[PDB]
Amino acid sequence: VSESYRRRRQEWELQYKQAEWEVNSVEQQINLQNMQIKAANKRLEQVEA
């Protein structure tokens, strides 16, 4: 039991920190979308011109 309680923490230690770094990774995908929002506006005004 003294070894098992020591082994247990490591599975949750990895699981939180990998999820915390994917919370970091997703932030690039939302910041990238500003460029296509700008492109669609810079597209539409040319047909009017």
């Binding site: 690039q28 910041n31 990238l32 460029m35 700008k38 492109a39 810079k42 597209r43 005004e45 040319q46 011109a49």
Partner: protein, 49 residues
């Protein structure tokens, strides 16, 4: 002969003035084309990040 000379020269005058003004119509379209497309370098850099 003088009246048909005046008339036929005035067609040659007002034809070439159309061919002139038809060129400058491209000037805004190049500006809008570059200032829309240039962002794909900044998107290709954001994708590398």
């Amino acid at each position: 002969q003088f009246g048909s000379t005046l008339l036929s020269l005035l067609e040659r005058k007002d034809s070439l003035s159309f061919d002139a003004y038809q060129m400058i119509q491209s000037g805004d379209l190049y500006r809008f084309s570059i200032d829309l497309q240039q962002q794909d370098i900044d998107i290709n850099k954001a994708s590398l990040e």
